[model samples]
Target: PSGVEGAAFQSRLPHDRMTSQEAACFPDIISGPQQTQKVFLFIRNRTLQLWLDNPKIQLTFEATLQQLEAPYNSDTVLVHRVHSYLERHGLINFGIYKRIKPLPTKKTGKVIIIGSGVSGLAAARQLQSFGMDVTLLEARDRVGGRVATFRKGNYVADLGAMVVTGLGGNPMAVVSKQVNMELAKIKQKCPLYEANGQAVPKEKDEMVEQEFNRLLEATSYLSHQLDFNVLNNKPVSLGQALEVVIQLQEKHVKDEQIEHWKKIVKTQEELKELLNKMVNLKEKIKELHQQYKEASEVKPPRDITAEFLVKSKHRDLTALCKEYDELAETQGKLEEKLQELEANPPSDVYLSSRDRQILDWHFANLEFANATPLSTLSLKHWDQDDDFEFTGSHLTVRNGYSCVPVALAEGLDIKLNTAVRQVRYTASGCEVIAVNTRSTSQTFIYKCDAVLCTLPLGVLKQQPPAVQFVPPLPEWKTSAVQRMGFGNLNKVVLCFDRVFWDPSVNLFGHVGSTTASRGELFLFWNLYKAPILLALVAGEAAGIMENISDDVIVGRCLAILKGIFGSSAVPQPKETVVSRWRADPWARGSYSYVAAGSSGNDYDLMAQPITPGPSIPGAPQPIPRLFFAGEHTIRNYPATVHGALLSGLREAGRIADQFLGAMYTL
Candidate 1:
């Protein structure tokens, strides 16, 4: 409950102090557009005639007058404020003191911000700071849309967004500092455990880690090649690319193993055979030469047949010597190559059972990172915004994450349980039809200069649609909503009577027994000595958990704990809290991601405002009447609080830019 500083200028006028006739005497100065210098007076000759038939003109004038009358009184504060405003633009005494008929007073832009999340609160605060009227509507009884936190006595559990992603350069982190909130950095010691009640050995863990790291390296290598394939109309998913990399590595390892065995066999058996063949060839050649020499010397004149036989023996001995030299050279080269192979045999190509389990664990971690399974995650642009991530250790709020939203919502005009049904907007301005969630029969229509819709992507993508647009969202906007991926990451917080796991370690992993159980209670985060273990079920596992009962979910978590720290050592939890984000109607899923067929550009499209039309020449630039702000709208930091905070500020700035630029003297 931090203090909220009030705006620079706020009116405290009493309506009963001024008569309607007196209010009508002053020419209502609307911070009008720049092109129209002719101020309309209540003269009835040319300007006095009100165009009631034209909805645009009628609504504009009514909105302006309503804004002006709220702060109107014959008080000296209003007089002086008006006097100074006109004096600044050098229009003093032109209409205020002159015999000009009464018209409208100056109008402050009114904006109805839908949703009371961080993004909505951000836009509301920014707009209010700039002297705009902001009204925040919330569907629930409290604020902090997806940042829900549960507390009972001394126990605390953040049902949503448990940790701040990054502290340095993060806007939410900056605000947390501004509010003087304590943040505990998550411990870096992450231990891994096998299915048995034992910690994984360091050597085995390191080996699998290296194996997983190599797989990622190969994934990156193949990712570059897939870009070419995508252009050729063969789009690939992240899971597909990862498996391809694995298969390619497997083939490479197989080929190296085959070559390794071939070299071993050649050195062991072939080298011996080559040596024996060369030795025999040398003996035969020596014997033949001897025979030739004896025959020649015995009798040159005694037998011509003996001479021919000696010549044939000479030819045979020469051929044997030639063949022996060839074998000797081959044997020498084979031995030299075989020695090199023996010195550095190919690395272990076979992935053990434990290695595969570790890989599954890594894949589950990736799913948590994206909040979507690798099968649906985009290979090309999944981590496109990783470069823009804030650099620092992630932290958890010591008190609660909801404190950030509570501090931001201070001094803001927020109405809870006001669920918006439809939004109608045009050049005339915007109108919102909202129903009271507490009482369905009570419906209210709110009219304002503009509307900011900060609804979650999941809600927007609902089949029946939670909130409807007047003319319906443009094809491009709706298409982006359809294309973007909304995913879930549920949590099961278990409170134990005493600490059983490693006290020093803040996080640990339970290597699942199978692929289907990869993300099932695989990660357990220690709420730092509260003796509470928060188990995260991400990706597809989380989606499945939404349909499960609380008892079943708790039992499943206890079973995991029992496997890690024997059944006798692990006691039943004293208390349990489970979050089913997908089941929540307000948040159909946890966050957004880049789907297999979608790119980062879809985030931009979601952020794009629905403008009235192009501005006319010499007129004030047209401002966006319908704006959007949420985590999904920002591309650089999706699925983060800072992204949502920054988007709110961005849209507020967009609206403020035009609103302030269009202001003119009375």
Candidate 2:
């Protein structure tokens, strides 16, 4: 044993092996017991010392480290050794984290961000850091949007996206590092089971399990392929995808049925043989009982007046017979079910219903380059179509995501509860007509150097007649705004009184697919103790859930649990909550997405701030004092929180450069 290794394998002192006095004589050595304590303290001190230099870095690093405790020291040492070994092999250039010092702001421009979600907040924070006067306009009172967390008693459950993909150079990682939020690795295990009507057999050696896994993998790959807009060109409905999957499933069912029938025939033959052997054994036992009865002048075993022995043997035989019968029945039912399912698959009907529901939402208008008929639309075709490309990126926010808006709004002059009714350009700049919701009877006019409109696309589309633009937007821009798709996503939170699942394992469960919609009710269980579960429902499913009562939602979920697990296994949740973003008129949909043939450039139009004066000779510039920064503004990381922050920074930086009259780098 040496260093920390010695303590890991060290024996007790005195009566054990080494005494404290003997260890002291070695100076660097000590008794195993003492050595262990010393090793732990030494490592703790080293970690604390490093963290003291920059608490934020230390906090985040420690957070990740804490997840791997006890034996983790050995892992850390191994990692270090591997790094050293790799260094010796070659000079590897891994990226390093460099602190970005803030640059001095020369000119502060007025900026506005429409959404207070991660993307909006990120933009606001970055822009604020660049020395811009930022104002975040959130239609909803609260922030964080899809990344929202629900509170039940002392527990906090994430109801939105919970996993961050560990890709190097990811913006979320950078933000996590900056904010001291630790990222934990998620280990997932999906098990396969074979079920008949009565009981399911644990199928470790079955080919059915392997085939199911392969088919699932194929389906996942197909889903990803359709995620991009390519399917719009030949947009096969979800029904089509389901049809294809059903065909694959039918082939599997047929194979399974044949195998099941073979097992059934074998089981019946075995039962018959066992019954014949039992009958012969019973005859022999009857003779023995008769002999014993005559010798003792007592009754035979089957006719014994004493109930004890009879009860015992009868109970044993009854149990065995019941087990055999149950197994046979289950096998027969399974085969019958397989045949029925193959005869009439349930994929196409379910997918078509879901597709129609999705089409009905129509929250965000998708602007298209060409008029593509909805009937011909397939996700594959949409992705390949040359018509319109989605302009925005998915929203991402760093620094608690919400901090972006708070930080951006710092020192900015804001008028709360005032809704802008209209805007008009003038020689000086622009005049905005705003109505005070608190005082609906009065209208106020505010004049500024420039006005940054960060309203939702839905609001812009349904622009009030009272609110007029100086020069109306072009037909294409309006059409783009109309055609862009706004999606509705809902978060359902269920809180239980106590934790039911193992805390060490991350709980992810899916219910059976419905015939109505792509809307799935998935549970992310016990995210943070007190047994809290978050259910995510997107697309049309969310809308339907919004219309339903909370009790109804809970009942539906309970029924789903009973179907998968037993009724007794379903947790009785104490509290449940649901968010209705789609129903909220202010925020039409969660965020924006590119329709078929939509590109990032289309979003640029949304980012373009309306200036008072005519467009510049080169490109339209923000008015002398007006600027816009939001998730819809960013190019690379559009929909992410980081993208929003970067966009805000870009706008703020532009103002800073103008004020300094020179370029500045940070």
Candidate 3:
């Protein structure tokens, strides 16, 4: 009775005893999906326990802070002390417990990046910034692979990736600005011409375009309803979905008045439903706000005398706000679309045969966009990344697309003409065996902490391995590689001495007479600055042209041009450049696409790093030593320069986080 009557210990307050009881009972059990194990902070016992779903401390890292007592003026200095100790020992690698500021260390990790494409170059630049030693091995003689630029006497021809698909939010846009290179906006003046050399009337052209767009919208709508489920016992595909929509829209005729009334009714029903949903969401948001405000106003209780609960509640509120905003935004979009439908009744008119032909051209264009046949594309997830598309007009680099890559490779340790032969990796490190193209007799082995393999998807799927992994890639990764689609899309660049056709128009379209010929030179680009007419061969046409001679390809493009603008009006090109990406050993195809049975998950799976270890009882997953980066790796912006660039940056950040460690942001 003589030992401080109301206190647990001599240094403790009356409330401190209660707080210690709370910590002892609750123990602050913290776990997350990404965490290696659940963390138990036992303040009363002055112990930290990592529980791998167990009562015992086995298969866990546990520590008792002997220095942690109740004498410190700072409340939860006990917690802070433990965190700092974990940081010092590099044990706090789990979610939420990770150190924001990496402790200073002499171990600057070494990384070997395969390929010197935009993705590889981007990774190299970023890794170097993290103080990681980066070495890039390029199979080609020059830096930029696929992003090739042929420069001769002030004339620049981008052999690959000419157009920056989108300007706004595009990394290429940032690169162009940073490199001080000009970006010429490709104007949207696409005039269509029939196979018979007759220019399509503007009214008819626009009507057909609108019809095609409607068909696409319907296809997308039905795809969601279908849920990749079978229709008429057939597996769902993009081409099949399109055909179904076309048959339903075009095969029947109904009364205009009846259709109008039906649309109005449907629109009204959806509009009311959306409004109700919004109201409910708003009510929840209001309640959330009230809860947040009340929590914010509350001062720390005397028990802990700390704002720990306040910080945690603030995070919860932030997440709620984000959720509420997203829901409201979605509701608003539906409401807006509903109003539009109510204001202007949608047309259900059947398209004419001529219009159908025009639609075939548009379909071919879709194939170009996907770089794969519609039959092979996934209906549910083909354009999964469309929501993430950059806004603003698509632009072409003024100097060359290669300028961006060239600029990124400036200070990097890039080895030109060094083809990677084999990659052997373990949980600890990696070894990259490469052969010099200049002298292929001797092979050099590069040892590094990690390896970022930016090889194209096509190369990974190559029959005779271009680069061999010491142990074959796991089934999860290889299946993704095999399941995803990679198709050809070649460019036939024709440089002419004199300008022909309409110099005012930026692009033009050709309506193929038959289904087989639809993708053959369907689109043409008129480089107004220079008298260069580029022809794009997509889908099956691109694959066929890969084996054909460059002269024949040029001739076919010239013939198409001649047919468009009379023989007398058209002149042969002074120089011509054609891309054979399909046949190129380095790049077997243009880019990747969501295949028939594949979804965005494949892309995600392909992006996963290889840890190179077997499952061990009670052990955490090993740190990934082999990472992947390329256009195919990123699902948000696939088949774009920005996608490749972002993927590289992502892998670099991953390496930094696991190896070099992250710097404190706040």
Candidate 4:
């Protein structure tokens, strides 16, 4: 080898294969032609990354391979060379998970699952397969919890968990295959629409989904760079870096809010009434913002915090918010969250309106998919969710996501419409519980050896009437549960008699006066089930929409649809259905996300099996009486149906681990 140190390999042929320090990087890194490379000093130092680059990246807990593959984006020969060499040297560990097989064991016990969501359903069935008596308790009237399905006349569509996410290695997709369910492969495409419903001719400028730029308002439209930056920052939560952008957009907040209100109001009376209100609110906001009114001078916002900001802003908003029921709840929370985000301006970021729009689009994109807001999203870790090899593409199951959970629950013992009230566990036995849906007052309990609490993180977080542990859980376990984030995503699906939107374009959206209102319900999924338009809204908008009745949402959707298709052209929907995941008592929100200031440790802790602690004196050497399994508990793929399904399977294996042989089996 020309440049290799003492650790050298003599090549028999010019292109001969050579083994590196580690055998893990198999079939890669050969003694090649013209491949002069050296991964000499400064490569393996954790100290260097923070020293030379942004320390925040490392602090956010991003992987080192990301920094190494920076210049070439993990695509070029140089990137591949580095990856192979690093992998060979055991510098990186890809595919760290080997298939964990449940150890065949003589110990079989009755297990109770607390919710009939994908996680609970899967956990119950898997436990059943392992020869354990399993009982599933559902809080709702149906089995599929978050994977809710609704049928209108002849059409069947999903009210929750629409997309299977990825085709390969996705547990949700695997379930789809096991059930022989048909999945409509969605082609990767997004066609932009103007404010006036004009479809930008792609050929005219040869713009693409990548060029999502023209991001409305005051900045560049769309750039993969935002995605890269979010992925690069890999802040762990989509909401993590959001406050940074939110702080930047604070100046435009008034204008943004006004624009959003303009589109939603229908009547002239409503418009005029709102107009007068907006003027007053603007004056009050400006009056409140002018609070830097320091006697004869202005103190300015830089010196202001939510305590001060909320003091002025809160007073004015509450008075104004009380007038509108929708505004009453969210408007206050928005101000509070913004104040928190505004207090800490990351990098003193004064991003342009367009810059904010692009970031807003990405944040909204993340929210739209995961049902989360930037407040709950972790920017640092979401990038990790896509680490799997890309043999799989995004797909929508023809029947619905409920099919997978439904099939899993077919032979299992499931009680529908039963809300879990509490769980008390011990080494000898565990007591399972629930209240009949018909009457929340009446309660019943089930005795089991173990209880797999597959309840959503949100449900667990909500105390009082929900499942409370006897004598309470460990502080550490409870803290993780409380700290875990929840996000909401609701959809308004409208089915028309005929398909009027262009078949050539799978997705299209109209620009609004402001980023918040522009395209919250922008994405439209067609084809696999054509003539049906699924409009998704996330974050605060979804929350706000959830408060309003479905009739109002349908009307709002139809007006937007007419504008997109020609105000006079599109026909009325024969039937309509809207999803309100956030409003559902059983499912407080759609999915989970990492919160800011948190890494994946919360999820890791949540995933840790809750074993009977140190046992009361000599209690038969304790066992795992309480176990947690939900998408929120899964670190790798949080906020996904597959994540929940995988979490359930993983917990089953973990419970099985105690009874299995010390020597692990495949």
Candidate 5:
């Protein structure tokens, strides 16, 4: 209606120029589809009519060449070119129209929701609002499957999922407000550098900030490009992608300029080792001072001889004196060496030659600060303050966000510690076979109008033969399950007895730059009052962390902190927690992402229902009765809590409409 007048004029232009109806019947030269041509014509006519009615809507030439594919060379022709060329031959637009149609919705029905995650909870709330009975089930002992919080002294620490983006369109904004949780802007602080065993003055803070910003921009640009390509089925390997980024950055810069940029972006790990070395030296110095005090206390200065006495009977005393002199000289030399190393130390290298040689060492042993791994790609710019923020984007709940699921399942019937063995459709409704963990001898059966399954895809795919269905699932459904990839994201939370670094800043300092060990210990000092640092490890890096012990992780983190903050910065954490989600029997991975060539439509298979027999007699064919709702089930917004919530609402709405036998349009 808005641009109808102009649209009608444009649509009639081609028809007016055409001498015969035969020419008008032909498809537009650009799209080569009659239906597509008609739609375009309709849009044109409608836009024109709307413009004439308002007299404010302006229409331009509207023909332009734009390349949507790659390698995006100048030679690539525009799609609109064909349309323009066709117009020159008087075979342009044709008047066409389609009446606006309303979508039909049915009656509200009973709904069964699996997994009381945000998706399930949101779905349940929506269904209840629509006058439908809803039940939410959770496999865990408590709910909030991923979102968990812990108490640290007087402060509350969000150990699992934290932070939501503040973008207007973000669904979390509405939900979080509804749930009474406030959103705060994330403010990052500048990193501290220890040089010559002292905190480098804050005068150079601006330089450090600029360098961090540059590094962040470069890394974010590269990561986004890579993600885009991957989603488009043109994925490039991490190594290849890095190489491309390096080449692009170096294209215009001289070798010297490139080196300068690298130095700015690179983190030093030797700084951490220097702290360890200094601590050891300090310990020795302290021991010597204490021994000297004890020796002085034993006797006055006058009673002890300062020099070795040359006497035939006192040979043992002279020998001891000589050994002490040698020890003093050695300690002084060690102190001097420590000082020299602190003055002119090596710059941290993430992938130094030494790191590549020690690839077999545990992740804690590896110099994570010095090397670059695929997992570190996301965190390369974690230290920088930039406009690129995750405030409005969806958040992934790691450790205890699971409380969301629990809260939603409250007052609902749930069988805790029970494993669903099989699901079958019966003449009346559905039957679910489950087993109790405590009792192997007894198998329980549940009969309901409908059954909702919220099991992880990994569990569903690896199910035993005993869990077979009466009617086999379609091949597409099985293929989708096999193809969907579950990503591994692990969080390492360290709680300190005392706050060492300034809690105001999010420090990402490292000791040395060597890839031999886990790259410099990337530390995330908490912004909250709690003295906690959370380290995120994803993909293959998560696997590496999963195999290590908590002590080793703590030691590695402390060593890195000591390097940046000197010996005084090492905090003895009261408790250390590690998330091993990947290795958990119930949850194989953290969340889901599309595989190399997978599309949103593949999820349809996951939503398909299981029916009784090959065909139902005197009943409507089996429509999708067993609905799947999770972060992965949401197409446009997968891997997010809000996405999961929206998806659950969508499914519940569908069931409600079917039950009420009412038609409504969205």
Candidate 6:
């Protein structure tokens, strides 16, 4: 209905235009590490040969053609980049080492899946493959859930989850292989602009970075002393000590006085060395503590000393800036101070202002990537994720994220415009009651052997609740729901008559001094396609934006462009698209973030089998009746499309283990 083509899969290149030769050339790209360096090397060779044949081939290449794969890096990054390239050139390998497949079973009579997002489709595809008659209910007129795509006559863009995050060990990647969707291996250049849109020059940027790095050295020292004092029972908490250090500002920082900071480095280096010693000591404590927990079965902290540093009053960088600026002045005063004060500096020392701007740029990028700001970020556990084996690159899905799920939904029993009202499960089976999303009087009751609920956390945690559970979900499940977070990360996409801003800038940030002023538009992706720009406004800014109208959001974004370019008749957009996940009836928020008091385990708990644990001896545990699958349910890879699909396969595996006597590894 939104003209997004979400109900079913559609290829951008017509089936009639597809040549047989094009279809047969496999990506040779899908196999495991299957991807990675091999693909990069192949691209280099191809470019060399092509350039040798036609000299202009060098100039005719996409900027990404020069993006050779890095050696010995993380596997997923290559899988993501290479797979995207192959698909764009029609070289995808559809069948090889096929994974997450279902086993044959004349078992479970029926299954009803609640939502039609990535998780729901993944579960249905696998479950249906097991010879079960499956039914999928979608509240919206179209499927896709948060993976919405928008299409205008000449331009296309994804209004929902875009990046596949990682590639290897990701089921969604396999699906992208199956559907032959193109991946855009784009690299962006981001230059920060002042609040008025003045692009900060390279010199100022360097100064900002130097100032910020200095703060890191100083903050690291203060954090060390603060924790040491707290350990000694000084009656002052680490939070209080951190507060005192943060309040050390107000005496320094002026744009005209940058030279004062230029000479302050000798002192900064001394503190850097001091902080390194503290970090080493903290590391030794972590190893010992881990061994104790491994043997004694206790919660072993990696570094309880560094644990204080996570929330060590550095949560809000805007607030962090002012305090760090009051740190130091010159080398002579600094050297003597280190000689006497050692780790504790005198009252006059402080961090500089230019450094705060640099720190803001770094934190702003984090806010954009995570769609949440730093200060309120769960410092203790915000970065807790499966360790990436090596650094990786972020790639884009060419036809929108809807390509894979739509391809999977082909010929499946997906009923659109159906809203779920309640799920009532008993020991033998479950019944899902629903009403037509548009029809007020129509009620449909689907009696099935089991049900999988793949609703996003945002929709599930809505006030008054979206779907009521009969007899109520268990306290454990209910408690976990309250512990997790779901925040809005809205976007404003503009289609202009022509690209006006710097082509070199793939991504850009706005330099705002305060938290409130900074996020009108934090980042934008120039992407490969042009006459179009995608600008993002995240977190606290996004929430406030939800209450504002499209005209205002559009006007604000256009103004941001003008501020950056400075005094230009940058024409208004020919068309604009705005996303409000918070207001959408289906999506209450964008994705889950670990709240102040929560951790990733909330995901594990939310997906806990509805089947109760052992009660009486020799009694079979009630077959898991009301199962769960969604990004919110998987702890290891939450808030990603890969996580969503993997969780679906995980839930299906559980059902298969009980009824079909099979284990399908992902």
Q: Which prediction has the highest TM-score against the true structure?
A: 1
* Residue 376, model 6: Cα distance from true site in angstroms: 3.6
Estimated TM-score for each candidate: 0.74, 0.53, 0.69, 0.63, 0.56, 0.65
Kindly provide the TM-score of model 1 when superposed on the true structure, using C-alpha atoms: 0.74
lDDT of 5 by residue, 1-666 (tens): 123333333322442232232244333423365544544444334333332333222222242223122232222222233333232221221101111222124424556565655666666655554456666545555555655566545544564456553443344433442233544445545353332223434544444444434544565666665443442345433334444554564553555455654443332333444456556665655565555555445543343252222222245444555555655565565556556545553444433343332221223221122122343222222222233233333332323344455545544545566656666665456666767656756787766566565665555566554345544556777788776656566666777778777766654433223333333333354545456677655334556777888788777666656766677767677766777776765566666655533555656566665555435577755545565666666555555565566566556645554455323110
User: Model 5 scores what on Cα lDDT?
Assistant: 0.49
- Model 3, range 1-666, lDDT digits (tens) per residue? 122221112112231233442332233322223221112233322332221112122111223333444442134543444443333222222111222345335538799999999889888876765567889999998877878886765567786788887755454543554566677888888989988877899998888889888888887888776574466775578898888887776555445646767876786777677678767767876776776677668765624433655666677768777876776677677678767766775455677668788888998899999987788888888889887766678877767778778877877899888899999997567899999887899789999988899999999998788889977799899889888998878887888788887878889998888777788888998753677777888777778877788888888777778888888877877778888888888889989998877889889998999988844555766788899999999888888787888788778767887885533211
lDDT scores in order: 0.74, 0.46, 0.72, 0.60, 0.49, 0.63
Superposed by TM-score, candidate 6 places the C-alpha of residue 78 at a distance from the truth, in angstroms, of 32
lDDT of 3 at 171: 48
Q: Output the worst ten-in-a-row residue range by lDDT, candidate 5.
A: 90-99
Ranking by lDDT: 1, 3, 6, 4, 5, 2
**Could you tell which candidate, 2 or 3, scores higher by TM-score?**
3
Q: Pick out the ten consecutive residues of candidate 3 with the lowest summed lDDT.
A: 51-60
Model 1, position 26, has a per-residue lDDT of 34
Worst 10 residues of 1 by lDDT: 1-10
lDDT of 4 by residue, 268-309 (tens): 344455556666766765665455343215333445554465
Worst 10 residues of 6 by lDDT: 1-10
Stretches off by above 4 angstroms in model 1 are 1-107, 225-234, 264-350, 613-622, 662-666
**TM-score-best of 4 and 6:** 6
Q: Cα RMSDs of all predictions?
A: 13.8, 21.0, 27.5, 23.6, 21.6, 23.9
**Predicted candidate 2 versus true structure: per-residue lDDT over 481-525, tens digit per residue:** 765545556667777775554466554444224324434454344
**Cα displacement (Å) at residue 262, model 5:** 27
Winning candidate number (lDDT): 1
Point out where model 3 deviates above 4 Å. Answer: 1-107, 226-228, 231-234, 253-353, 614-621, 663-666
TM-score-based ranking, best first? 1, 3, 6, 4, 5, 2
Between candidates 1 and 6, which one is better according to lDDT? 1
